[PDB]
């Protein structure tokens, strides 16, 4: 079928009068600057290529906004895990889908076209394995389908409570696997995701939960297409422990010990000093950057500007989803190079002074490397995901090319994306969803039940 | 008339099943806990007390967003001033009235019931008074009518470039009046102002812009019960500037000089040193907080935590307009403290854990004093000013009191608030104004006349 943007964002930069043509698979197959509509369905406003989330926790969504309760005088990431730690306790396997579904229809209200669903619940609840093992993956699975989002799955190896292969604890009991059972969960779901046109990778959860033998065992499984990604320095915690047990920081022990390279998405990489900032730009490796989690958690500001200066490559994500907003997630990226440096206009490059479109032109770039899949831009072969901003906003009506992409990022809100597509599925119409009723009622139910 | 909430934050906090009475004139009458809604408008959803907006300057937010554009390896606030500069000489009284509605339109549908206008723009092109001195102050009391928003007018007396009474720049020539002339304005708006059911403050446009001797003018001018405003400490530069000109900070000036109290409303006080934070904490003036534009501007952080432990007074203030939402300010004023101190739970109370609560609570005190208005509380003989969340939505549904504001202001987002109401009338009704397709139309064309 065919598509009309008076407006849209190119590889190349904007365009004018565009006709896309897109095949029944989903796939844009050629797209046309300066042509008529000629009977190709007229766009509501300015086109991008939708936005990749490349890190989620999708069963947090259901707490999101419950942990801000003063427990401590110096509440923190450590107290805040204890009660995430409880509430994932709790989760029966269909209220995990329940939460997923709903929140994917979320992020793709938000501008979010696919997902990277970093995935560590994997047992029962006293820990045993559920009959089928690869039981919550699929239910993950299944809920991106039921919202229609695109999606990477994260299955997430997790053994131990931290460095130098300590005994998990309690709380982390329905994460545990070890690594011949994790490599038969990859198997089991290479068939069903397959058939899902769904995306898989490797992943560590960290440092922390898995040993360096562990990472070698993964590594060298034969799965050397696949992304993998791994939760680094969010914490200065972290960091002291990891120092205290190999001498080294994190980032630095990873490079030292691991070849990392553009396969590699490293999330939040927080505490990165100016050799580990310098290590992860030369080597194409994508740092995961959760702006709202990382504030809501406290876990201190990126140096992205040092980073992007030296061709850093990252995205964004929504981590636990206190936020569904590719607006607030980019603005606030920007916002906290400002805070920290206390000058405005931080993050540009030497080819583009306009903020809103260097930020959106990075997290896209980083956001489909990290996720594996052919997105993030609007070009023949690759996958026809996009949104639709308000035309009728007088804000971006009012804006031409960049000027509106700052408008958006800088002054407007979620409200700014009214139609979404994903795989040449309309899947948002005019801020809808059809699936939205159906799911509040029975994500209503679950929050009852929590 | 009679409106009917089946959750409410009252003063002694959430209540149930509350029944509204409201006057001819839009004042509380009545409020009945445990009531029931025969012949009351049965409410859609949670009812909190509207938000007032302690600081802005609405001609801004038609620059919004655009300012964002490196022009210099490091850009400066400074810079981007000289930018603002650049718009308001083209700005005529048709096109301030226009931006105005539209603004006040917005700020209503994201919560904010009242605002604070402080409003520096005065004169022609020129710099010349025009006919009537009073016309763009006007302009904005009647745009404020026409969105139906609460307004507080802060007039500003600008003189002044920096310190020391330096000669004001071409730049500047629209905001300048000397001492006698301002307090003439401020006479000539009582009446109109009043009229329109509006508010008047004082208000000092820094400490760079007037002079010692004009704020004792104006100060000794027997305006006793009015509000009084000020830009102060933002920067890292007024600070520096201020040292270099009397030996001391600028707050720390402000309070060795002037008698500093409840009426004051100080204006960002980014930049305020342990002394200072205690001095503002105990004078019991209200630090008018605007995070959005703070962190756009690279302001810097406030130190919230310390001034709120000491029994500090704060409001917020959408200021240049960046942003117009009552969750991102409250939310990213707390998350600001968590990335300083890398730690979570940062803003609450003794006797309150809630972070939610503890934020609304405090904008809605400071907000309502700096304003000098009857809001900022579901009270009988307070003005009627409140918001509706949706009901129907899934988070808010499922929780209940303080919980619900966590949801909303950390979780949530703006299309939560559907219904509006000032001073008794409804003025936002399931997300949408009366006027904003008729005010749209204006605006859009404005912004294509300015650009
Ligand atoms: N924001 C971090 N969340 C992590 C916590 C961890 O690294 O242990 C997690 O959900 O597993
Ligand atoms: N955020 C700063 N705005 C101020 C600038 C100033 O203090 O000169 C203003 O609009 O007057
Ligand atoms: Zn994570
Ligand atoms: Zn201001």
Redesign the pocket.
Known sequence: SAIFAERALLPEGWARNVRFEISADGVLAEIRPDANADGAERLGGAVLPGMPNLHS?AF?RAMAGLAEVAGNPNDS?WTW?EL?YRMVARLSPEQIEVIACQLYIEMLKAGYTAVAEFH?VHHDLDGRSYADPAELSLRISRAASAAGIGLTLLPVLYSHAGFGGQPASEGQRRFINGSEAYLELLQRLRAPLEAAGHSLGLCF??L??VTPQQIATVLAAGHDDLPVHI?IA?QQKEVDDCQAWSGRRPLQWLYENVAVDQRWCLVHATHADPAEVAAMARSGAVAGLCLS?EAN?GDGIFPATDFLAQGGRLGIGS??HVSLSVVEELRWLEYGQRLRDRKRNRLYRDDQPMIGRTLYDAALAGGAQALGQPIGSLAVGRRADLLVLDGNDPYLASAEGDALLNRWLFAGGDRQVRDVMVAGRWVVRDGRHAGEERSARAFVQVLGEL
């Open positions: 926790h947090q990431f895990r995430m560590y959860h960290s922390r939960a939760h969010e989690t958690l981590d636990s």
